[PDB]
């Protein structure tokens, strides 16, 4: 997978997109801890526009 | 020498 | 004989009477 | 449809026995058969007879000529130099088939006189009057004459009809097949102080003109076979059943109170077997005879059962009540379905054995609970998955070799090994449980009621077998009756589990797909092992997830490997809600050990044991601990205990300790958790924190609150903490120190359990608890550190073993003055002395066990001492002890002891075929070949045991250690 280090209060931000996006089967494939998540490789550049909204 | 299976607690009817 | 003496095994003529029967009743 | 292999049909038989001489061990009598020839030109008539000296034979009061030859006396010639076992097995099968009444053959060939040929061509009746004499029978019938003086009733001399299957040829001439049904008239002229018990109902009892003897007249109007006819003559104490009044119980003298207490349950067994089936008991009486030196522990004949007296217990004896209770129950099940409905061939025996075992399991379910039923079914299935993977497989319903992977022929019951016979009955009742699983239990009981109702309409006709063959069941008739009552046929299930002879092996492993929320199972079969076969049917799997327990059916075709089943939510981890179980209840689970991404708590492949299988599932250790704690199935708790021995983590110790503390768990699961906790504790030494395992738990459960090291006085009235209390030090003694020695904290605890034992206050005996204490003392013995093979003397004894030796000396000597119920402490102390001799503590001397293996001792002491002598002659390679054991096989009075010596010498052999031993002479090969050929010619169970011993020692080919 793709290791992504983030904030514990921000981990659930990417989880809401998993239950909303209907592109693939599941966005988040594995959750290590509150500061480490995994992902199919393709939405870091898209999140840079979403972060402005966030 | 007896039942010894607590059946009324596992299968109540 | 001094340490651990065993009473020797004697055969009975009818062994079920001394085996199966209760003695305190 | 039944067509006879015999050219005549037997209608009636009179068996008259006079002059039963107990001093000379001799009977005289006659036999009068009433045959109707079915084919003209009958000429020779072939009857079965062993050991009887035939004096004269008269056919229709005309003197006839007979010739007798028994090919099974010496199977191979004495001057043949063959020594391989396949030759003997083929020759023994041919010899048994040459005396088989299931073919047209027989041992006594009587020639019809010439003037009766015009009486035999137009098919009219022939009355054959043979008179015979048994001079001193070897195994023909049971004889027990004690050596106390007095009259034969004053010393306790009794007779039993010993033997199995078709062994009535051993005491009168007959047609000894299960398919020749006739009516019977039985007269026995015995002493005036004795009673003669037999089949039928006693019509009268007349005195002789000197009033010193009396004749018992029995009549059997229900047409039975000759193989179901029995006899017990002795000075029996008669007891009429106070609940059912056609049932009489006979015991040996001075054992009437034990008989009163023991046979007081039997009316409930009668009521059960007459309400699950809807037929009443078919015979007009029932007689239970309790005898000494019995052949088997329980034998069932027509309207009669012969048990051994060792089943008789008093009111204060526990741990023997369920065993005697289930012996009575299986004798009654065989009364219904082995003696009333009989066998049509030697094939279709699986039908009768399966129906008997299945209705006895239904009795066990109602009486002792479903928990005990599931535990029994699992232990029978494990027995099979062990025997069939060990050697070949058991083939129910062969077709006539059909099974060539074993060293005997399965064409006849008297060539089968005894372990094969036991596993045959076991597999038959498990396959009947499988037929109940496919076709529901009420339809199954309707099948059995239809068979019994056809037999009981058949049993009242007088036509000589026009209709008496409806009392004989076959496989095709059984399957046709199943198809009549249900509309489904079971021919795939019959083709897989009956006609094919194998069990299946399942290797399962799972993986949870988090993305698609599925559970990917991976089930592969090992079908290339010698005992296995390939399963292609459906397979149930039960998955416990957080949302509950869900069942799934998987189709396991040959090319199948990955099975994707769907998984449910994990919203019972979001809120704390209770997780619902397999039954309707729900519990609080500690979900800290569970994975965060998977909802599934445990998986069980084939939970209902619906195939004959051995499962090897690879769960995670927390899933095994959840399955041990929160499952509502005892077989899953047992398999999780069995699988937790590979995970010695402290969470598994906490799981087994929580199982041990928990009443409302089935007691046989806690008794297994004791031994599992002992093994786990031995594996995590140098990590264990506090006291030894189960000690604090023993002091919490069974000791005083004010004194921790003093045990409470014995009150055994709970029967589940009694079993747990007597099994916990036995497992606690398997604790080992880092130094591999049992700790002196557990040995001291066991010795304080022995010292502070007070049994003056409970209403039950203490013999089994004290015997288990001796077993716990024997478990603590580690091998001694002998230096330079130092002779084991009294001064260089271990300081630990001196206390153990003092205790077993005290226990054995006190047993010599105040004996136990069945000398359980003698058996435990002999076993413990053999344990101390197996390590280097006591000198390796077999003289004590050789003195306890004499004839006058109780039979449990005898078999424990002979087990110790067999273990000694395996370890010390003793030639003279092996010759002692072989001599005791040849001439011992009790034939059960001879069979047990051959059995123990097969299980623990002195050498195998791979070993080079000093005991592999040509002399030993010649002795064992002479024991197979001659010598064991009178029992049919000693000869199969000698064949098993020759197979274990020398194999199927030519003995290698030979010129």
mmCIF file of N, CA and C in Angstrom, chain D residues 324-396:
data_model
loop_
_atom_site.group_PDB
_atom_site.id
_atom_site.type_symbol
_atom_site.label_atom_id
_atom_site.label_comp_id
_atom_site.label_asym_id
_atom_site.label_seq_id
_atom_site.Cartn_x
_atom_site.Cartn_y
_atom_site.Cartn_z
ATOM 1 N N UNK D 324 -22.790 -49.317 33.930
ATOM 2 C CA UNK D 324 -23.730 -50.428 34.031
ATOM 3 C C UNK D 324 -25.078 -50.068 33.426
ATOM 4 N N UNK D 325 -25.495 -48.814 33.597
ATOM 5 C CA UNK D 325 -26.759 -48.346 33.027
ATOM 6 C C UNK D 325 -26.746 -48.425 31.507
ATOM 7 N N UNK D 326 -25.647 -48.018 30.890
ATOM 8 C CA UNK D 326 -25.596 -48.084 29.439
ATOM 9 C C UNK D 326 -25.323 -49.484 28.919
ATOM 10 N N UNK D 327 -24.715 -50.375 29.713
ATOM 11 C CA UNK D 327 -24.653 -51.778 29.315
ATOM 12 C C UNK D 327 -26.034 -52.426 29.266
ATOM 13 N N UNK D 328 -26.869 -52.157 30.278
ATOM 14 C CA UNK D 328 -28.260 -52.620 30.246
ATOM 15 C C UNK D 328 -29.012 -52.050 29.048
ATOM 16 N N UNK D 329 -28.766 -50.775 28.735
ATOM 17 C CA UNK D 329 -29.460 -50.133 27.625
ATOM 18 C C UNK D 329 -29.070 -50.722 26.272
ATOM 19 N N UNK D 330 -27.787 -51.000 26.055
ATOM 20 C CA UNK D 330 -27.433 -51.573 24.764
ATOM 21 C C UNK D 330 -27.798 -53.040 24.652
ATOM 22 N N UNK D 331 -27.898 -53.759 25.780
ATOM 23 C CA UNK D 331 -28.446 -55.114 25.711
ATOM 24 C C UNK D 331 -29.905 -55.091 25.293
ATOM 25 N N UNK D 332 -30.676 -54.122 25.791
ATOM 26 C CA UNK D 332 -32.079 -54.034 25.391
ATOM 27 C C UNK D 332 -32.246 -53.569 23.945
ATOM 28 N N UNK D 333 -31.368 -52.680 23.477
ATOM 29 C CA UNK D 333 -31.395 -52.275 22.072
ATOM 30 C C UNK D 333 -31.087 -53.446 21.153
ATOM 31 N N UNK D 334 -30.146 -54.307 21.550
ATOM 32 C CA UNK D 334 -29.904 -55.512 20.770
ATOM 33 C C UNK D 334 -31.000 -56.547 20.923
ATOM 34 N N UNK D 335 -31.771 -56.514 22.018
ATOM 35 C CA UNK D 335 -32.966 -57.348 22.111
ATOM 36 C C UNK D 335 -33.971 -56.963 21.044
ATOM 37 N N UNK D 336 -34.132 -55.667 20.817
ATOM 38 C CA UNK D 336 -35.080 -55.230 19.792
ATOM 39 C C UNK D 336 -34.555 -55.521 18.389
ATOM 40 N N UNK D 337 -33.305 -55.165 18.098
ATOM 41 C CA UNK D 337 -32.851 -55.133 16.713
ATOM 42 C C UNK D 337 -31.634 -56.009 16.436
ATOM 43 N N UNK D 338 -31.407 -57.043 17.221
ATOM 44 C CA UNK D 338 -30.429 -58.028 16.816
ATOM 45 C C UNK D 338 -30.967 -59.434 16.931
ATOM 46 N N UNK D 339 -31.999 -59.582 17.758
ATOM 47 C CA UNK D 339 -32.569 -60.872 18.118
ATOM 48 C C UNK D 339 -33.974 -61.068 17.586
ATOM 49 N N UNK D 340 -34.769 -60.005 17.522
ATOM 50 C CA UNK D 340 -36.093 -60.133 16.934
ATOM 51 C C UNK D 340 -36.023 -59.980 15.420
ATOM 52 N N UNK D 341 -35.540 -58.831 14.952
ATOM 53 C CA UNK D 341 -35.197 -58.675 13.549
ATOM 54 C C UNK D 341 -33.758 -59.120 13.372
ATOM 55 N N UNK D 342 -33.555 -60.149 12.574
ATOM 56 C CA UNK D 342 -32.258 -60.751 12.369
ATOM 57 C C UNK D 342 -31.718 -60.395 10.993
ATOM 58 N N UNK D 343 -30.635 -61.052 10.637
ATOM 59 C CA UNK D 343 -29.794 -60.738 9.500
ATOM 60 C C UNK D 343 -30.125 -61.662 8.341
ATOM 61 N N UNK D 344 -30.136 -61.123 7.127
ATOM 62 C CA UNK D 344 -30.404 -61.983 5.985
ATOM 63 C C UNK D 344 -29.142 -62.627 5.419
ATOM 64 N N UNK D 345 -28.004 -61.936 5.467
ATOM 65 C CA UNK D 345 -26.730 -62.483 5.027
ATOM 66 C C UNK D 345 -25.685 -62.094 6.061
ATOM 67 N N UNK D 346 -24.398 -62.279 5.749
ATOM 68 C CA UNK D 346 -23.408 -61.627 6.604
ATOM 69 C C UNK D 346 -23.264 -60.165 6.223
ATOM 70 N N UNK D 347 -23.365 -59.849 4.939
ATOM 71 C CA UNK D 347 -23.764 -58.510 4.558
ATOM 72 C C UNK D 347 -25.169 -58.257 5.094
ATOM 73 N N UNK D 348 -25.508 -56.970 5.248
ATOM 74 C CA UNK D 348 -26.683 -56.424 5.943
ATOM 75 C C UNK D 348 -26.552 -56.573 7.453
ATOM 76 N N UNK D 349 -25.338 -56.794 7.954
ATOM 77 C CA UNK D 349 -25.095 -56.755 9.389
ATOM 78 C C UNK D 349 -24.947 -55.326 9.872
ATOM 79 N N UNK D 350 -24.466 -54.447 8.985
ATOM 80 C CA UNK D 350 -24.338 -53.034 9.302
ATOM 81 C C UNK D 350 -25.687 -52.403 9.597
ATOM 82 N N UNK D 351 -26.762 -52.924 8.998
ATOM 83 C CA UNK D 351 -28.103 -52.415 9.260
ATOM 84 C C UNK D 351 -28.483 -52.656 10.712
ATOM 85 N N UNK D 352 -28.302 -53.880 11.194
ATOM 86 C CA UNK D 352 -28.712 -54.226 12.549
ATOM 87 C C UNK D 352 -27.819 -53.567 13.589
ATOM 88 N N UNK D 353 -26.498 -53.599 13.368
ATOM 89 C CA UNK D 353 -25.580 -52.940 14.284
ATOM 90 C C UNK D 353 -25.792 -51.434 14.311
ATOM 91 N N UNK D 354 -26.139 -50.838 13.173
ATOM 92 C CA UNK D 354 -26.401 -49.418 13.136
ATOM 93 C C UNK D 354 -27.686 -49.031 13.829
ATOM 94 N N UNK D 355 -28.739 -49.839 13.678
ATOM 95 C CA UNK D 355 -30.001 -49.514 14.338
ATOM 96 C C UNK D 355 -29.880 -49.689 15.852
ATOM 97 N N UNK D 356 -29.176 -50.742 16.290
ATOM 98 C CA UNK D 356 -28.935 -50.949 17.715
ATOM 99 C C UNK D 356 -28.140 -49.799 18.321
ATOM 100 N N UNK D 357 -27.007 -49.451 17.705
ATOM 101 C CA UNK D 357 -26.204 -48.348 18.209
ATOM 102 C C UNK D 357 -26.892 -47.006 18.123
ATOM 103 N N UNK D 358 -27.729 -46.802 17.101
ATOM 104 C CA UNK D 358 -28.405 -45.523 16.945
ATOM 105 C C UNK D 358 -29.504 -45.335 17.983
ATOM 106 N N UNK D 359 -30.325 -46.360 18.229
ATOM 107 C CA UNK D 359 -31.357 -46.193 19.255
ATOM 108 C C UNK D 359 -30.754 -46.193 20.651
ATOM 109 N N UNK D 360 -29.590 -46.822 20.840
ATOM 110 C CA UNK D 360 -28.905 -46.699 22.119
ATOM 111 C C UNK D 360 -28.333 -45.299 22.308
ATOM 112 N N UNK D 361 -27.908 -44.655 21.221
ATOM 113 C CA UNK D 361 -27.510 -43.261 21.315
ATOM 114 C C UNK D 361 -28.667 -42.319 21.575
ATOM 115 N N UNK D 362 -29.847 -42.627 21.047
ATOM 116 C CA UNK D 362 -31.037 -41.848 21.385
ATOM 117 C C UNK D 362 -31.405 -41.994 22.854
ATOM 118 N N UNK D 363 -31.238 -43.206 23.397
ATOM 119 C CA UNK D 363 -31.423 -43.411 24.833
ATOM 120 C C UNK D 363 -30.428 -42.610 25.641
ATOM 121 N N UNK D 364 -29.170 -42.601 25.216
ATOM 122 C CA UNK D 364 -28.153 -41.823 25.914
ATOM 123 C C UNK D 364 -28.440 -40.333 25.841
ATOM 124 N N UNK D 365 -28.976 -39.869 24.712
ATOM 125 C CA UNK D 365 -29.361 -38.469 24.582
ATOM 126 C C UNK D 365 -30.451 -38.098 25.567
ATOM 127 N N UNK D 366 -31.540 -38.879 25.618
ATOM 128 C CA UNK D 366 -32.615 -38.577 26.571
ATOM 129 C C UNK D 366 -32.166 -38.722 28.020
ATOM 130 N N UNK D 367 -31.384 -39.754 28.337
ATOM 131 C CA UNK D 367 -31.022 -40.013 29.724
ATOM 132 C C UNK D 367 -29.954 -39.054 30.234
ATOM 133 N N UNK D 368 -28.807 -38.988 29.562
ATOM 134 C CA UNK D 368 -27.684 -38.211 30.053
ATOM 135 C C UNK D 368 -27.564 -36.849 29.396
ATOM 136 N N UNK D 369 -28.527 -36.413 28.587
ATOM 137 C CA UNK D 369 -28.417 -35.093 28.030
ATOM 138 C C UNK D 369 -27.796 -35.068 26.642
ATOM 139 N N UNK D 370 -28.108 -34.004 25.894
ATOM 140 C CA UNK D 370 -27.529 -33.840 24.527
ATOM 141 C C UNK D 370 -26.018 -33.602 24.642
ATOM 142 N N UNK D 371 -25.578 -32.831 25.640
ATOM 143 C CA UNK D 371 -24.127 -32.564 25.847
ATOM 144 C C UNK D 371 -23.367 -33.894 25.849
ATOM 145 N N UNK D 372 -23.824 -34.870 26.640
ATOM 146 C CA UNK D 372 -23.191 -36.177 26.716
ATOM 147 C C UNK D 372 -23.354 -36.950 25.416
ATOM 148 N N UNK D 373 -24.480 -36.759 24.722
ATOM 149 C CA UNK D 373 -24.648 -37.349 23.390
ATOM 150 C C UNK D 373 -23.627 -36.816 22.390
ATOM 151 N N UNK D 374 -23.426 -35.491 22.357
ATOM 152 C CA UNK D 374 -22.457 -34.895 21.430
ATOM 153 C C UNK D 374 -21.040 -35.330 21.758
ATOM 154 N N UNK D 375 -20.710 -35.424 23.045
ATOM 155 C CA UNK D 375 -19.379 -35.871 23.447
ATOM 156 C C UNK D 375 -19.138 -37.321 23.068
ATOM 157 N N UNK D 376 -20.164 -38.162 23.220
ATOM 158 C CA UNK D 376 -20.045 -39.563 22.832
ATOM 159 C C UNK D 376 -19.894 -39.717 21.327
ATOM 160 N N UNK D 377 -20.685 -38.970 20.548
ATOM 161 C CA UNK D 377 -20.607 -39.029 19.093
ATOM 162 C C UNK D 377 -19.242 -38.559 18.604
ATOM 163 N N UNK D 378 -18.693 -37.515 19.237
ATOM 164 C CA UNK D 378 -17.368 -37.042 18.858
ATOM 165 C C UNK D 378 -16.282 -38.042 19.217
ATOM 166 N N UNK D 379 -16.403 -38.737 20.355
ATOM 167 C CA UNK D 379 -15.360 -39.699 20.695
ATOM 168 C C UNK D 379 -15.435 -40.936 19.805
ATOM 169 N N UNK D 380 -16.634 -41.314 19.350
ATOM 170 C CA UNK D 380 -16.750 -42.424 18.409
ATOM 171 C C UNK D 380 -16.198 -42.043 17.039
ATOM 172 N N UNK D 381 -16.444 -40.806 16.608
ATOM 173 C CA UNK D 381 -15.933 -40.350 15.321
ATOM 174 C C UNK D 381 -14.413 -40.231 15.329
ATOM 175 N N UNK D 382 -13.834 -39.756 16.441
ATOM 176 C CA UNK D 382 -12.377 -39.719 16.555
ATOM 177 C C UNK D 382 -11.789 -41.116 16.578
ATOM 178 N N UNK D 383 -12.466 -42.056 17.240
ATOM 179 C CA UNK D 383 -12.001 -43.463 17.223
ATOM 180 C C UNK D 383 -11.888 -43.906 15.760
ATOM 181 N N UNK D 384 -12.930 -43.653 14.959
ATOM 182 C CA UNK D 384 -12.929 -44.051 13.519
ATOM 183 C C UNK D 384 -11.849 -43.290 12.739
ATOM 184 N N UNK D 385 -11.724 -41.972 12.939
ATOM 185 C CA UNK D 385 -10.746 -41.199 12.118
ATOM 186 C C UNK D 385 -9.340 -41.605 12.551
ATOM 187 N N UNK D 386 -9.232 -42.387 13.627
ATOM 188 C CA UNK D 386 -7.933 -42.920 14.031
ATOM 189 C C UNK D 386 -7.714 -44.331 13.500
ATOM 190 N N UNK D 387 -8.738 -45.184 13.572
ATOM 191 C CA UNK D 387 -8.580 -46.557 13.096
ATOM 192 C C UNK D 387 -8.484 -46.634 11.578
ATOM 193 N N UNK D 388 -9.283 -45.852 10.861
ATOM 194 C CA UNK D 388 -9.268 -45.918 9.405
ATOM 195 C C UNK D 388 -8.040 -45.264 8.806
ATOM 196 N N UNK D 389 -7.496 -44.224 9.438
ATOM 197 C CA UNK D 389 -6.216 -43.720 8.972
ATOM 198 C C UNK D 389 -5.060 -44.603 9.412
ATOM 199 N N UNK D 390 -5.235 -45.383 10.481
ATOM 200 C CA UNK D 390 -4.179 -46.292 10.909
ATOM 201 C C UNK D 390 -4.028 -47.464 9.955
ATOM 202 N N UNK D 391 -5.121 -48.164 9.661
ATOM 203 C CA UNK D 391 -5.072 -49.357 8.811
ATOM 204 C C UNK D 391 -6.286 -49.412 7.889
ATOM 205 N N UNK D 392 -6.103 -48.951 6.649
ATOM 206 C CA UNK D 392 -7.065 -49.210 5.595
ATOM 207 C C UNK D 392 -8.409 -48.543 5.766
ATOM 208 N N UNK D 393 -9.410 -49.326 6.140
ATOM 209 C CA UNK D 393 -10.719 -48.784 6.428
ATOM 210 C C UNK D 393 -11.739 -49.858 6.726
ATOM 211 N N UNK D 394 -12.827 -49.481 7.380
ATOM 212 C CA UNK D 394 -13.926 -50.386 7.662
ATOM 213 C C UNK D 394 -14.927 -50.297 6.520
ATOM 214 N N UNK D 395 -15.282 -51.440 5.958
ATOM 215 C CA UNK D 395 -16.206 -51.518 4.831
ATOM 216 C C UNK D 395 -17.515 -52.127 5.312
ATOM 217 N N UNK D 396 -18.498 -51.279 5.587
ATOM 218 C CA UNK D 396 -19.854 -51.765 5.793
ATOM 219 C C UNK D 396 -20.418 -52.214 4.457
#
